[PDB]
Structure 1
Amino acid sequence: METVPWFPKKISDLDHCANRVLMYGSELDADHPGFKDNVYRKRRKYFADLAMNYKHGDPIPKVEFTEEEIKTWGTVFQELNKLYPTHACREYLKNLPLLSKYCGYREDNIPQLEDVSNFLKERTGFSIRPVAGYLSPRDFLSGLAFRVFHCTQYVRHSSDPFYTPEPDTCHELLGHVPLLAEPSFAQFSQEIGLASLGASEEAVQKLATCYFFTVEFGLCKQDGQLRVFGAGLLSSISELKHALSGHAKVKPFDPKITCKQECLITTFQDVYFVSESFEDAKEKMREFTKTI
């Protein structure tokens, strides 16, 4: 019995997928990253309940971060900012100062999702909702159709600030947000979501893999040199350096090819894809979505 899967028809309908969170020991066959740390586990439950209780139209709950959480943020923020000028794409560097000015991006302060959401709404019409963890590719991409980015609010475990196998709020705020503030990138991202809505399982998988190798882990060509625009790279001190080290394979971004590449979880990627620019990746995606 083949039916079209339910899809959101307006922004408030994301209330009916934001709590469909994939869990360790259930949908996800993997260990929780501070599982054996009872204190970390308790703190993670606090963050999950804030997300689960959220409903469209609520202000996003403001959190008093612990001293340890703030320190982890500061370590990540300080070391990544030493890398950005040489590693980050131009569009990323243009937007980062604005977030420092308006949203409290500082070494000693974790920006609040409510403030960042308000900033994005003014710049590109993007908004945030808090989320307890991963959603399905279909659900996550459905948010993008309404320019909603589902964001984790917890901080990665202090036992490895340089790379985490799971997204955290450092990753959302330093990896994703500065490019969500750029109109061409915001358009690019929305168009992935729009193409996903009610699509086939196969079309969703392919769109998700294209997202992974652009929004998550993309490299781009700028003035004859590779720079980084993938959010998963821009939030890892160790993978950001790796991507431009020459230790990894690179291929040209090409949706019909890129959509077949395995997305690696819990390690550095084996391969990065290089887009010429945001406009060109967007054009390539437009040509590809006609076919699926």
Structure 2
Amino acid sequence: DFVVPDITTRKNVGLSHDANDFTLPQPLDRYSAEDHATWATLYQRQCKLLPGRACDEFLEGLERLEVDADRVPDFNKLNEKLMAATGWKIVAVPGLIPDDVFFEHLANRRFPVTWWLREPPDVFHKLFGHVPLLINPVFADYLEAYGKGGVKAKALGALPMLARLYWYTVEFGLINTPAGMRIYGAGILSSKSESIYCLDSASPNRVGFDLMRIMNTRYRIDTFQKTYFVIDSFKQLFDATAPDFAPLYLQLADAQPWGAGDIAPDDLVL
């Protein structure tokens, strides 16, 4: 029955965005005291739960970028540190943006960050979850290479195959370490409960990273992942982008995808 405006619409009232690249100056005046307090609450919650769960590089990135514990960060201030580390910067966007625009940003070492915050894929998820690893030069190079692939993928109708790769790496990836399994996916790192389940539960599959397998795997957004893909190094991700994806897309185009909860005959199951 009744339809009401969504959070993206409400938050962006009176604001504008580039019609081509979808950026805007970060609207600092729009963050209320409640927003800063919500940020602080989420930050404190995650920083209590993540030690021994997040990969070490993630927690180090928070500190090296001086990500504010007590307020929504000033993007420009964060950029001074990020630019010096890896030549990356974050740019504010209104919310969900078109894929070609998103890929063009990453291809140019710009990471789009939704500016607004949830009330008590918002700025907490996109900044706290996604940005700290951009100080890692190997991970940053993986994201740049990913972005550069957007033109080819769009031309071939293969953007959803790249979306699966992004989902199962950047958003929901795990990294194995001698100290045990750790988390690098931003969607897990900003989550209250998925960081617990993804390491502690016997329920989800933990499967070794395989590029073709992943690009042939469905995902859903409404639920905890049924399968997590595990890398041994960020180098594995960057190296996965080396070959020509065009013949991989065409091979996959006619295949039946793996379901979100499937185990494939060739999986290294961890």
TM-score (norm 2): 0.80
Preserved contact between residue 52 and residue 131 of structure 1 (Cα < 8 Å)? no
* Long gaps (5+) in structure 1: 1-30, 159-166
Structure 1 residue 266 corresponds to structure 2 residue 222: yes
The structure-2 alpha-carbon separation of the partners of 1:64 and 1:136, relative to structure 1 and needing over 3 Å to count, comes to closer
* Aligned-partner Cα distance in 1 for 2:104–2:21: 16
Query: Residue 196 of structure 2 aligns to which amino acid in structure 1?
Result: K
Question: Counterpart of 1:244 in 2: which secondary structure?
Answer: helix
Partner of 1:66: 32
* Aligned-partner Cα distance in 2 for 1:41–1:216: 20
Partner of 1:286: 242
Preserved contact between residue 127 and residue 148 of structure 1 (Cα < 8 Å)? yes
Query: Residue 141 of structure 2 aligns to which amino acid in structure 1?
Result: Q
Preserved contact between residue 171 and residue 187 of structure 2 (Cα < 8 Å)? yes
Partner of 2:133: 179
**CA RMSD, Structure 1 to Structure 2 (Å):** 2.7
1:82 corresponds to which of 36, 48, 51: 48
Structure 1 residue 149 corresponds to structure 2 residue 111: yes
1:263 Cα offset (Å)? 2.4
* Aligned-partner Cα distance in 1 for 2:79–2:26: 9
Preserved contact between residue 137 and residue 208 of structure 1 (Cα < 8 Å)? no
Structure 1 residue 129 corresponds to structure 2 residue 88: no
Partner of 1:16: none
1:55 Cα offset (Å)? 7.5
Partner of 1:169: 123
User: 1:107-166 deviations in whole A, cap 9, x for unaligned?
Assistant: x221112222332222111112211111233332221100111110111121xxxxxxxx
* Aligned-partner Cα distance in 1 for 2:157–2:242: 17
User: 1:212-241 deviations in whole A, cap 9, x for unaligned?
Assistant: 111111001111521000011111122222
Partner of 1:248: 204
Query: Residue 218 of structure 1 aligns to which amino acid in structure 2?
Result: G
Partner of 1:15: none
The structure-2 alpha-carbon separation of the partners of 1:275 and 1:43, relative to structure 1 and needing over 3 Å to count, comes to same
Preserved contact between residue 131 and residue 151 of structure 1 (Cα < 8 Å)? yes
TM-score (norm 1): 0.75
Structure 1 residue 45 corresponds to structure 2 residue 12: yes
* Aligned-partner Cα distance in 1 for 2:38–2:197: 21
* Aligned-partner Cα distance in 1 for 2:25–2:8: 25
1:58 Cα offset (Å)? 7.8
Q: Identical aligned pairs, as a percentage? A: 32
The structure-2 alpha-carbon separation of the partners of 1:256 and 1:202, relative to structure 1 and needing over 3 Å to count, comes to farther
Question: Counterpart of 1:222 in 2: which secondary structure?
Answer: coil
Partner of 2:151: 197
Query: Residue 95 of structure 1 aligns to which amino acid in structure 2?
Result: G
1:71 Cα offset (Å)? 2.1
* Aligned-partner Cα distance in 2 for 1:62–1:216: 27
* Aligned-partner Cα distance in 1 for 2:9–2:245: 43
Structure 1 residue 109 corresponds to structure 2 residue 71: yes
Partner of 1:96: 62
Question: What is the count of residue pairs matched by the alignment?
Answer: 244
Deviates more, 1:262-271 or 1:77-86: 262-271
User: 1:3-27 deviations in whole A, cap 9, x for unaligned?
Assistant: xxxxxxxxxxxxxxxxxxxxxxxxx
* Long gaps (5+) in structure 2: 249-270
Preserved contact between residue 141 and residue 196 of structure 1 (Cα < 8 Å)? yes
The structure-2 alpha-carbon separation of the partners of 1:87 and 1:288, relative to structure 1 and needing over 3 Å to count, comes to farther
Query: Residue 169 of structure 1 aligns to which amino acid in structure 2?
Result: V
* Aligned-partner Cα distance in 2 for 1:249–1:216: 16
User: 1:184-233 deviations in whole A, cap 9, x for unaligned?
Assistant: 11001101111222433443222221111111110011115210000111
* Aligned-partner Cα distance in 2 for 1:264–1:282: 25
Query: Residue 285 of structure 1 aligns to which amino acid in structure 2?
Result: T
The structure-2 alpha-carbon separation of the partners of 1:138 and 1:64, relative to structure 1 and needing over 3 Å to count, comes to closer
